[PDB]
Design a protein around this nucleic acid. Sequence first.
DNA 1: GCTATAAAACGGCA
DNA 2: TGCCCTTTTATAGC
Length: 187
Amino acid sequence: VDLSKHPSGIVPTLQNIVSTVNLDCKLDLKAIALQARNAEYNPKRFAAVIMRIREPKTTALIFASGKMVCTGAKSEDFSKMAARKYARIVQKLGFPAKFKDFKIQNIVGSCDVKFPIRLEGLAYSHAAFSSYEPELFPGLIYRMKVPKIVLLIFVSGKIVITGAKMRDETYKAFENIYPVLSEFRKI
DNA sequence: GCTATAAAACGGCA
DNA sequence: TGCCCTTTTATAGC
């Protein structure tokens, strides 16, 4: 571990990435679901073809406007890789698709501080940022302002970090919360 | 299954 | 632009 970028000694592992791209050509969704072997399309349920690939394990939402959403990947490069796989699938069906304005939209990470946490003590001295409602959700919601990231903190010490467009905001958010968590370590 | 968190796309409706 | 709509993922309590 590079202790200069992770003073805690723990690196959060990315669990999910959402990315968008414009193939920049209108697509016949009804025909794409008929020809492709792993595609579903219920326009009454959602106005998109839902298509999945095996490597990398992802799910794509393909719209008639030509826009595409890619979910499920574990790295930004995997998300871009999967997105180009879906785009070529559309090209082999006859559509003049491109790869315009690819952009990572959301990054989900998680980690484990490996000690129990007193959530209500945390909520009391960080009330301006936190929301703890154990009968609605068993985890404390921490809305970090700098960088703007939301963290879900649980009694077991497991952490969920979401809202990042760059993986460094994920890391900085965890490093800002780590000394607070150890301060509320359940002894 | 629900409850909560972030994000995008589209279609329907005030 | 707001609300809803779906997909993905860790987490966990009902």
